[PDB]
Each structure stands twice: as structure tokens, then as C-alpha cells.
Design an enzyme around this catalytic site. Structure first.
Site, PDB file in Angstrom:
ATOM      1  N   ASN A   9     -33.563   0.454 -17.013  1.00  0.00           N
ATOM      2  CA  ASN A   9     -33.764   0.589 -18.285  1.00  0.00           C
ATOM      3  C   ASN A   9     -32.913   1.926 -18.564  1.00  0.00           C
ATOM      4  O   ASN A   9     -32.125   1.719 -18.322  1.00  0.00           O
ATOM      5  CB  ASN A   9     -34.782   1.764 -18.074  1.00  0.00           C
ATOM      6  N   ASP A  31     -32.433   2.843 -21.543  1.00  0.00           N
ATOM      7  CA  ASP A  31     -33.630   3.872 -23.130  1.00  0.00           C
ATOM      8  C   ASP A  31     -32.611   5.019 -23.030  1.00  0.00           C
ATOM      9  O   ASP A  31     -32.109   5.631 -24.291  1.00  0.00           O
ATOM     10  CB  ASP A  31     -34.421   3.997 -23.263  1.00  0.00           C
ATOM     11  N   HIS A  32     -32.168   6.156 -21.904  1.00  0.00           N
ATOM     12  CA  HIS A  32     -31.422   7.274 -22.368  1.00  0.00           C
ATOM     13  C   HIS A  32     -30.429   7.100 -22.502  1.00  0.00           C
ATOM     14  O   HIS A  32     -29.448   8.475 -22.329  1.00  0.00           O
ATOM     15  CB  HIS A  32     -32.492   8.071 -20.791  1.00  0.00           C
ATOM     16  N   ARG A  83     -25.504  12.524 -30.898  1.00  0.00           N
ATOM     17  CA  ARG A  83     -24.072  13.639 -31.474  1.00  0.00           C
ATOM     18  C   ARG A  83     -24.150  12.303 -33.129  1.00  0.00           C
ATOM     19  O   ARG A  83     -23.473  12.320 -33.958  1.00  0.00           O
ATOM     20  CB  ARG A  83     -23.065  13.221 -30.805  1.00  0.00           C
ATOM     21  N   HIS A 108     -36.630  -0.483 -24.507  1.00  0.00           N
ATOM     22  CA  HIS A 108     -37.853  -0.158 -25.060  1.00  0.00           C
ATOM     23  C   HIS A 108     -37.429   0.029 -26.914  1.00  0.00           C
ATOM     24  O   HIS A 108     -36.771   1.249 -27.122  1.00  0.00           O
ATOM     25  CB  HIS A 108     -38.731   1.069 -24.370  1.00  0.00           C
ATOM     26  N   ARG A 132     -38.882   2.201 -30.060  1.00  0.00           N
ATOM     27  CA  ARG A 132     -39.910   2.443 -29.933  1.00  0.00           C
ATOM     28  C   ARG A 132     -40.438   2.671 -32.004  1.00  0.00           C
ATOM     29  O   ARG A 132     -38.489   2.018 -32.284  1.00  0.00           O
ATOM     30  CB  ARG A 132     -39.924   3.992 -30.193  1.00  0.00           C
ATOM     31  N   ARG A 170     -36.426   6.492 -31.641  1.00  0.00           N
ATOM     32  CA  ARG A 170     -36.452   7.999 -31.118  1.00  0.00           C
ATOM     33  C   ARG A 170     -35.050   7.674 -30.623  1.00  0.00           C
ATOM     34  O   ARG A 170     -33.361   8.407 -30.748  1.00  0.00           O
ATOM     35  CB  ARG A 170     -37.415   8.644 -30.134  1.00  0.00           C
ATOM     36  N   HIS A 171     -34.780   6.532 -29.520  1.00  0.00           N
ATOM     37  CA  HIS A 171     -33.134   6.065 -29.466  1.00  0.00           C
ATOM     38  C   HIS A 171     -32.700   4.448 -29.079  1.00  0.00           C
ATOM     39  O   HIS A 171     -31.539   4.934 -30.303  1.00  0.00           O
ATOM     40  CB  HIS A 171     -33.776   6.127 -27.535  1.00  0.00           C
ATOM     41  N   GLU A 207     -39.463  -3.395 -23.340  1.00  0.00           N
ATOM     42  CA  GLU A 207     -41.040  -2.985 -23.993  1.00  0.00           C
ATOM     43  C   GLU A 207     -41.077  -2.874 -25.506  1.00  0.00           C
ATOM     44  O   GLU A 207     -40.193  -1.876 -26.945  1.00  0.00           O
ATOM     45  CB  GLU A 207     -40.357  -1.722 -23.554  1.00  0.00           C
ATOM     46  N   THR A 241     -55.692   8.948 -20.511  1.00  0.00           N
ATOM     47  CA  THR A 241     -55.621  10.679 -20.117  1.00  0.00           C
ATOM     48  C   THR A 241     -53.935  10.628 -19.558  1.00  0.00           C
ATOM     49  O   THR A 241     -53.768  10.971 -19.837  1.00  0.00           O
ATOM     50  CB  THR A 241     -56.803  10.802 -19.899  1.00  0.00           C
ATOM     51  N   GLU A 268     -48.087  -4.019 -15.015  1.00  0.00           N
ATOM     52  CA  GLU A 268     -46.719  -2.377 -14.371  1.00  0.00           C
ATOM     53  C   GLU A 268     -47.863  -1.291 -14.091  1.00  0.00           C
ATOM     54  O   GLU A 268     -47.943  -0.719 -14.852  1.00  0.00           O
ATOM     55  CB  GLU A 268     -45.556  -2.630 -15.329  1.00  0.00           C
ATOM     56  N   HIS A 288     -41.529   4.028 -13.676  1.00  0.00           N
ATOM     57  CA  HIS A 288     -42.065   4.735 -14.683  1.00  0.00           C
ATOM     58  C   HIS A 288     -41.883   6.189 -13.669  1.00  0.00           C
ATOM     59  O   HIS A 288     -42.411   6.655 -12.346  1.00  0.00           O
ATOM     60  CB  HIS A 288     -42.968   4.932 -15.142  1.00  0.00           C
ATOM     61  N   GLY A 289     -41.023   6.858 -13.663  1.00  0.00           N
ATOM     62  CA  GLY A 289     -40.843   8.508 -13.102  1.00  0.00           C
ATOM     63  C   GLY A 289     -39.666   8.553 -11.959  1.00  0.00           C
ATOM     64  O   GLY A 289     -39.998   9.223 -11.169  1.00  0.00           O
ATOM     65  N   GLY A 326     -35.351   4.009 -14.930  1.00  0.00           N
ATOM     66  CA  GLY A 326     -34.333   3.950 -16.086  1.00  0.00           C
ATOM     67  C   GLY A 326     -33.572   5.792 -16.252  1.00  0.00           C
ATOM     68  O   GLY A 326     -32.504   5.732 -16.073  1.00  0.00           O
ATOM     69  N   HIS A 327     -34.693   6.477 -16.778  1.00  0.00           N
ATOM     70  CA  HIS A 327     -33.923   8.088 -16.577  1.00  0.00           C
ATOM     71  C   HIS A 327     -33.313   8.092 -15.294  1.00  0.00           C
ATOM     72  O   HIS A 327     -32.179   8.518 -15.237  1.00  0.00           O
ATOM     73  CB  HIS A 327     -35.103   8.856 -16.975  1.00  0.00           C
TER      74      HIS A 327
END
Lengths: 242, 242
Positions: free
Chosen positions: B8, B10-11, B19, B44, B46, B50-51, B71, B102, B152, B192-193, B214-215
Site C-alpha cells: 500500500n 498511501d503514505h 508540501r 486508497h 479517500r 487526504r493523500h 481501496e 467500534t 481482509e 493493517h498495522g 503500507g505505512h
């Protein structure tokens, strides 16, 4: 001596804050940069704490092998923090609407007494203070009056230039800025907006002391790694300054 | 067959939007990722942009050597966009408050008909649809009902675990999640994570198809480069799955 490279690690923290993790650590990037030849590490703690946190600055103080350039907005909070941190270098930047010029530099001319007190407090702590200003003769002269040893010229408009003619004009402003500053006995820096394809003409300017570059180095590091990104940028600057 | 790595990007765009430049380009990172062994590229787009931007997805479609995993949040505007783009893989994620559980996964059980239509429309365009859900029996079973070929699992809680005992419990949820999904004939993903120090127990799970990370890859790329970061992550996964 030769031109100097200060590596700003703010946007390493930008990536970290995106997921609220403990990685990537801007501290690690800072240590990689020094190991890769950086002459100093620049860190900007914003009031909104957008990227860098207090934790970052405090750890950096304990681990840096070179010297810290602490960028800050002129507030009581940041001055008191800096008086604690005792950074070797510091740089006063605009964060709020009142201290901002249209171009983006610090309006020293508009707040001379306020800046003078800040410079005095930081200098009393042993910090060599720089003022982030536009390449405007009026701001440069004000910077000299308030007793700052150094200025960092806003190279943003040079970097944002759309046509070659516009870039030539903006590069000429920076060039004239450096000449004026050094005539007033100021140390003259630059770096904002600079990347691997526009840095060389700026580094070629006679009398430029240090370039503080952050975002482009971080961006490039995504592809080659922080150590190689820092080394490549420094090599460009040294070859151009020759 | 072997475990698969989806990267991924995204970041990379996160760092770009900071910038507002053209660098770093998530497109370049994706092409580096494929070249370094990635099995697919995840992106992804959005609603808030956002990115990732529209530009990112459209250029990727033209340059990808593997396959895109798109995504998206389920809206009419976004479904139509996907129907034009026609990604090989797609993954439905929550973006709005009502569709969030939640734990953070897509509330498929609460909106079965809405999701069912989304899956059908994307499948009609030739896309293999995945649902980003919690490792919860009720969401897994709902996903099978709506006709999605894949799920997923949200590995966030496993990744966010503070004590070893908590992490063992959360890993067990994931393990049970995979088992249930495959019993219903679903392809089961995660990612994720996950980072370079907790990915292996997840990759070791029997029946895990593909990890979308990703991140952590982007974060690690800052130090070793995107090509090496992607390759290192894949090797960890392969060694753990065998």
C-alpha cells in the site's frame, strides 16, 4: 570553508504522526544523516505540534553528534523550552498570521522589539540565532539591527517558479540578498523548497554558509535511504560551490 | 501457493501532500515496489482526498506491471469511478461514521444489501472484491452472504497490543478468523498495522492469502529505500509461511 548542509527531519515525523506509531523515528533519521555527512540537524517544534514533538527535541539533545538547529515560532513557550534545550543554533520562523509576510518569511521589520528580545534570550543561552526572512533588503537590514548573527533566505519563490525567466529573477533576489547580508556582517543561509534539481544554482552563490534542506531529502530518502539521500545532496552542494 | 505481499502506497502521498509538490510520487514507489517483488499494489482513494488523488489512480492504471488493489468507501461517486478504472482487485473500507464498527472494520452486517450491490457492481467489472472487516464471526459470515470472494481482517488490535498476553489473544482472534473464512470458501487477507517485528506470526497463519502492508513499509523505506524495504518485508513473510 566549504558550504554546509543542515538536514531538517520534520517530515520524518510527519510520516510517524500519520498512524500515531513510534516509527519512523526522526531521531534515527537524524543519526543516519550525521553518519552520512550532515553538518547539523534542524528540527522545528511547532505550536500545533503537527509533526515534531517535545520528545523528539529532548532525545535529539542527548544523541546528536554534531549540533542542533532549533526552529521555533517566537512565543514564551518556545523560548523557555529553548532556554532549557540550549541548542547550538536556533532559527525564528513565522507560524501565526501576524508574524507572516505575504511571501512567507518572518516580518522582523514589523516586530523589531519582539524579535530583539527573543534573539537576546536565545543568545544568552549560547545559541547562534538565525532569522527566517524573505530576500527583501528591508527585512535583511532589520535583522541586522535586532542583533541576529544570521539570516536564512526564503528560497520558496525560487523553487516555485513556473518559467525559467521567473526563476532567474528569484535566484537573482537570493543572490542580492546574500551580498547585502554579508555586507552587514550577517551569516547567510537558505534552503526552503530546495530539491535535487534546483539546489545547485543556489549552492553556487558566493558567501552562502549553510543550506537547511528537509522535505526533498526526506522525499528522496523513500527511494534510496536516508544515508544515501543525505550524501547525494551534500555532494551536489560541494560540487556546485566549487 | 505461497503467501502474497500487497504494498500500500498511501503514505508516500501523505509525505507529498505535506508540501504540495509532485514529489515524492506514489507512482514511482509503486513501480519500485513491483520491481522489488511486490505481488500487487494497493491504493486508497479517500472521499476527503487526504493523500491519494485521482491523478495517482489513473497513472497507476497505465504503469502497473502487476495488479491494482483499489481501496474505497462505498458511495455512488466512487463506485462509478471504479467501474471506469476497472481494477483487478478492490477492497471495501469504512470512511463514514455509520459504516464503522467500534474496532474499525466495515460494518457489513449492518448494511448487507448496500454492500451486496457494491460487490455485484465491482464484480461485473471483473474485479475481485475484498471486504475490510474485524476478525469477528458475525462480520465474516455476513461477508460470505453478500457474495464477496475475499475478506481482509483488521489486524490493528493485534498490532496495537501492549502486553504479550494481549497480543497472543488478538492473534488467536485472527487465526480463528482465517479458519472461519476459508470454511466459508473465502479468500482471507490481513495486513493493517503490521510491521517488521510483528508480521511473522501473522504470515505463519495457515491459509493466509495476502498481506496488504503500507505505512510500515513506507516508514522503513526512509532508511533503506523502497526497493529494499519491500524486498525485506516479503522475505520475512515467505520464511514465516513455510
Amino acid at each position: 570553508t566549504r558550504i554546509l548542509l543542515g538536514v531538517n527531519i520534520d517530515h520524518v515525523a510527519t510520516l510517524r504522526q500519520a498512524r500515531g506509531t513510534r516509527y519512523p523515528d526522526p531521531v534515527k533519521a537524524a543519526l543516519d544523516a550525521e553518519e552520512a555527512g550532515a553538518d547539523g540537524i534542524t528540527v522545528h517544534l511547532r505550536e500545533d505540534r503537527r509533526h515534531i514533538q517535545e520528545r523528539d527535541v529532548r532525545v535529539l539533545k542527548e544523541v546528536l553528534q554534531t549540533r542542533m538547529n532549533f526552529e521555533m515560532g517566537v512565543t514564551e513557550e518556545m523560548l523557555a523550552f529553548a532556554e532549557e534545550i540550549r541548542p547550538a543554533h536556533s532559527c525564528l520562523v513565522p507560524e501565526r498570521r501576524e508574524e507572516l509576510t505575504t511571501e512567507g518569511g518572518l516580518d522582523v521589520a514589523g516586530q523589531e522589539q519582539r524579535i530583539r528580545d527573543a534573539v537576546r534570550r536565545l543568545a544568552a543561552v549560547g545559541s547562534e540565532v538565525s532569522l527566517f526572512i524573505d530576500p527583501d533588503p528591508r527585512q535583511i537590514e532589520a535583522s541586522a539591527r535586532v542583533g541576529a548573527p544570521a539570516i536564512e533566505l526564503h528560497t520558496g519563490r525560487y523553487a516555485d517558479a513556473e518559467d525559467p525567466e521567473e526563476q532567474a529573477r528569484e535566484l537573482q533576489r537570493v543572490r542580492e540578498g546574500v551580498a547585502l547580508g554579508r555586507s552587514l556582517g550577517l551569516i547567510v543561509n537558505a534552503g526552503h523548497g530546495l530539491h535535487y534539481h534546483n539546489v545547485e544554482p543556489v549552492a553556487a552563490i558566493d558567501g552562502i554558509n549553510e543550506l537547511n534542506i528537509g522535505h526533498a531529502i526526506v522525499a528522496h530518502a523513500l527511494f534510496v535511504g536516508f544515508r544515501q539521500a543525505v550524501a547525494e545532496m551534500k555532494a551536489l552542494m560541494l560540487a556546485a560551490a566549487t
